[PDB]
């Protein structure tokens, strides 16, 4: 893993020492080599977990997230190298530095073997996405969005630190495997209830849970494309990864304490899909779709079933890829028409044929077309939830219906229909953004072909 | 101000706290504090403006009252035990007199009402000398008597210090008052960790000093007196916005900055001594401190406030004000967190 | 009024360079940065990386556990032993409390 971390570290001197006419090319090519290098973590020929060192390790859950971060980093560069053309060279290199630092810190975060180092890297990733959103955002509300995001995450994460220090004093080392082996059953007392709530609330905030999800839509609306990618495809999955890591020491009182969060997740995905039906902003609609999918992930992780964990892992990866792709399409339309309005651009099926094909395939991934890993995660989550309780099928079915509704509503009102002929400034297509589209969609096809790579710890 | 008086006043400023740390006697620690007060009054009234006169008068009366409560405690101990040391059996009333006097020496809440007033109306260099140098000798006396202090009143003073400091830092716009309320919050942190281990108290003191000195220096470069003044720093000196952001984030205690380390290890030993409610309240008020820091960063670095015409000749002229010590202290206040076991004794 | 520059208008980039690829303004950097993301993204990653993970043997012991299961089914069915015992652990090695 350390052979993954170091060349990503040396990407930063390459960025700051490259020529201004070669920085984008050099960093994009070498980050593609980083993704190729990080692909070696799938060499898992035995059941034992790849403990590389005393502070770095790989798992069947941690490996796809590392590969995903290393894969989106060149995609972040490719999408961000168009709205930074009218920009200073030093600021361009600084933005590339922020993206590379986010990738490095997330790789260490997923490969962490220690929860306190996981927390240190948690805020280490919290910082530069704030910098990206606040400095390179477009509208006035980027400062308010950054404040909302930062302080939701911090007010979540401080009780996590409190509970981590207490459990470290209790057991001795707070190492994941030592906890997993010498796990002790809690006495189901009130102090243990508050400990559970404290150590769960950070990840529940940053997922986000329903009711506390208000930072996410404004963050994705005011964020640039690379910030939208990093949040919607890595950081929500980081919260889920944190819950999967920490839930092993919380038996047995999570059995009854999971009750309000399962209800919040189910009703939250219902109401956020309703918002997606009634929403006038494309970025907001994709953001609320992300809230609904992460609500499914919360429900699976809370019910703690092997099918639930596997479906949560596959939905993590599938939703990260398809949410980045949808945000990329929305951002391409945004640099076309300089407006984020859902209904303003309508007849893009004519002018952009192949981009409309990418739109159709992205929305088909969004509404969980078979046999894609989106459907695999969503369906196995339904399986585990119906095993948990039979009446979850009603809420799940309403959510699935409204999911198909908002995906086809997106396609119909953005591509199909009569063309807005007043829009003169419709550039045909960039090979850059089309390459970005194909590099988003092809890994979805490959993971559909081989879903055994992203099953996770359980199965 | 001639070199003779400059040397005398600066040497007395240095000599006071060094006498206080090096000396065994309560009498000699008191006279070292006395030296520091008399030495630093004229530099507060150096500029001879009415605001400087107000600041010097408030500072003098507060420090004199604190010195005499210290002296009362010393004489009462010497009556009770016949010695010049709070040894082991000195009275808790005497110790509470010492603690109240040393807290009002320091400027932590509810004795904090003078510190923004005094640090306002004085030049930035003397605000720096105050808010860094003047708070070591009371910490020397407090560290000298760590096991004997009353943890209840210590923790109450600390938590109200952090609450009032966070609220004042949120409200104020003037940079000197912002620094004063940041000081009050940090002294709350040190005072809370004081009875359990003075080593982390000294670690937090050093981290606060090495964060506060270069931020004050960046204030000295343009005499940026207000949020607007530090906001047009992008046109004044654009090469320091990154370090301004990093220093204020380290003052906020975000990981992976090394300013997170004192708060983190203080909270760690607070849980080692089972005061979880105390530590949680302190940590959320530290988040509020980070809020007004983040708003300051939003004003000065991440956004670009409108600039005026004469900043063109500000760019025309050249400056050699940032000294050799600024960058070293900034780097040690920004990227020192992997050296945490070496920083912690 | 305060002396602010007017709003910059985004020009047609295809007007000056009809072979624009999205990557940079001048044609020389435009075509080479295009060639980098295809040769390093599609060619050496989406093909070689796909081939590398396609030929990983015994991924999480899936092929081994099939061969071992066929061995154990062979071992138990020819000797009259049950396919699966109800207790994973031998009860003689477990000492239950007296009451």
């Amino acid at each position: 893993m350390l052979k993954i971390i170091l060349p990503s570290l040396m990407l930063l001197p390459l960025t700051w020492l490259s020529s201004p006419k070669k920085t984008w090319t050099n960093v994009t090519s070498y980050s593609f080599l980083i993704s190729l290098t990080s692909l070696t973590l799938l060499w898992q020929t035995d059941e034992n977990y790849k403990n590389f060192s005393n502070m770095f390790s790989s798992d069947p859950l941690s490996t796809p997230l590392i590969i995903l971060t290393a894969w989106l980093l060149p995609l972040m560069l490719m999408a961000s190298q168009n709205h930074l053309k009218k920009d200073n060279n030093v600021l361009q290199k600084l933005y590339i530095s922020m993206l590379i630092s986010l990738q490095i810190l997330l790789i260490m975060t997923f490969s962490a073997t220690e929860l306190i180092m996981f927390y240190i890297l948690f805020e280490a990733t919290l910082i530069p996405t704030l910098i990206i959103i606040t400095r390179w955002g477009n509208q006035t509300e980027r400062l308010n969005a950054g404040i909302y995001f930062l302080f939701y995450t911090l007010i979540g994460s401080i009780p996590l630190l409190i509970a981590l220090i207490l459990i470290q004093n209790h057991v001795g080392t707070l190492n994941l495997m030592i906890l997993s082996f010498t796990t002790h059953t809690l006495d189901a007392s009130w102090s243990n209830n508050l400990l559970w709530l404290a150590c769960m609330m950070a990840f529940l905030i940053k997922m986000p849970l329903y009711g506390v999800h208000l930072w996410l839509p404004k963050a994705h609306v005011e964020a640039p494309i690379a910030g939208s990618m990093i949040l919607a495809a890595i950081l929500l999955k980081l919260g889920s990864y944190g819950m999967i890591r920490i839930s092993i020491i919380l038996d047995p009182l999570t059995k009854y304490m999971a009750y309000p969060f399962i209800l919040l997740s189910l009703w939250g995905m219902i109401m956020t899909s309703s918002i997606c039906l009634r929403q006038t902003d494309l970025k907001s609609l994709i953001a609320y779709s992300s809230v609904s999918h992460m609500a499914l992930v919360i429900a699976s992780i809370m019910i703690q079933t092997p099918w639930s964990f596997m479906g949560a892992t596959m939905l993590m990866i599938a939703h990260g890829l398809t949410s980045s792709l949808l945000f990329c399409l929305a951002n391409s339309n945004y640099e076309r028409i300089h407006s984020r309005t859902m209904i303003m651009a309508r007849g893009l099926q004519m002018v952009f044929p192949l981009m409309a094909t990418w739109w159709l395939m992205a929305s088909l991934a969004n509404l969980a077309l078979p046999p894609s890993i989106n459907l695999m995660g969503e369906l196995f989550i339904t399986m585990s939830l119906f095993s948990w309780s039979n009446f979850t099928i009603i809420l799940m079915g309403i959510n699935i219906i409204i999911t198909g509704m908002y995906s086809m509503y997106m396609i119909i009102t953005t591509q199909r229909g009569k063309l807005t002929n007043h829009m003169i400034n419709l550039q045909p297509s960039h090979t850059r953004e089309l390459t970005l589209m194909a590099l988003h969609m092809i890994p979805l096809i490959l993971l559909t072909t081989s879903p055994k790579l992203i099953t996770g710890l359980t199965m | 101000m001639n070199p003779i008086t400059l040397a005398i006043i600066y040497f007395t400023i240095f000599l006071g706290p060094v006498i206080t740390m090096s000396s065994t006697n309560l009498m000699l620690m008191w006279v070292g504090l006395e030296f520091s007060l008399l030495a630093i009054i004229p530099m507060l009234i150096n500029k001879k403006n009415p605001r400087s006169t107000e600041a010097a008068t408030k500072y003098f009366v507060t420090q004199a009252t604190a010195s005499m409560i210290i002296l009362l405690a010393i004489v009462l101990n010497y009556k009770q035990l016949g010695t010049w040391m709070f040894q082991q059996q000195t009275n808790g009333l005497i110790l509470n007199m010492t603690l109240m006097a040393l807290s009002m020496k320091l400027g932590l809440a509810p004795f904090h009402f003078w510190l923004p007033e005094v640090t306002q109306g004085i030049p930035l260099h003397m605000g720096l000398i105050l808010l860094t140098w003047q708070k070591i000798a009371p910490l020397s006396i407090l560290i000298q008597i760590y096991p004997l202090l009353n943890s209840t009143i210590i923790l109450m003073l600390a938590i109200t210090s952090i609450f009032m400091g966070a609220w004042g830092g949120l409200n104020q716009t003037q940079m000197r008052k912002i620094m004063a309320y940041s000081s009050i919050a940090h002294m709350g942190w040190m005072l809370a960790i004081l009875p359990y281990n003075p080593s982390l108290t000294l670690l937090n003191l050093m981290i606060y000093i090495i964060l506060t000195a270069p931020m004050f220096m960046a204030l000295m470069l343009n005499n940026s007196m207000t949020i607007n003044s530090i906001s047009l720093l992008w046109n004044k000196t654009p090469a320091m916005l990154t370090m301004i952001s990093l220093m204020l984030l380290s003052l906020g205690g975000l990981p992976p900055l090394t300013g997170f380390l004192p708060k983190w290890i203080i909270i760690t030993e607070l849980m080692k001594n089972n005061c979880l409610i105390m530590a949680t309240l302190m940590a959320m008020m530290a988040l509020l401190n980070l809020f007004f820091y983040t708003r300051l960063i939003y004003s000065t670095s991440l956004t670009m406030f409108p600039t005026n015409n004469n900043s063109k000749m500000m760019t025309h002229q050249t400056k050699t004000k940032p000294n050799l010590m600024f960058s070293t202290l900034a780097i040690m206040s920004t990227m020192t967190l992997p050296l945490a076991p070496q920083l912690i004794t | 009024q305060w002396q602010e520059d007017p709003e910059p208008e985004d020009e047609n980039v295809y007007a000056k360079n009809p072979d624009f690829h999205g990557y940079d303004s001048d044609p020389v950097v435009d075509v080479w940065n295009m060639r980098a993301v295809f040769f390093f993204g599609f060619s050496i990653v989406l093909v070689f990386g796909t081939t590398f993970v396609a030929y990983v043997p015994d991924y999480r012991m899936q092929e081994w556990a099939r061969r071992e299961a066929e061995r154990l089914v062979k071992y138990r069915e020819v000797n009259g032993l049950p396919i699966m015992e109800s207790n994973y652990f031998d009860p003689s090695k477990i000492q239950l409390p007296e009451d």
Binding site: - | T173, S231, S299, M304, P306 | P8, D10
Partner: peptide, 19 residues
């Protein structure tokens, strides 16, 4: 199309010594 940056009113909301 240009990024929004603070204007006179956003710059003047920080002056007044009380906020």
């Amino acid at each position: 199309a240009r990024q929004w940056q603070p204007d006179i009113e956003w710059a003047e909301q920080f002056s007044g010594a009380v906020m």
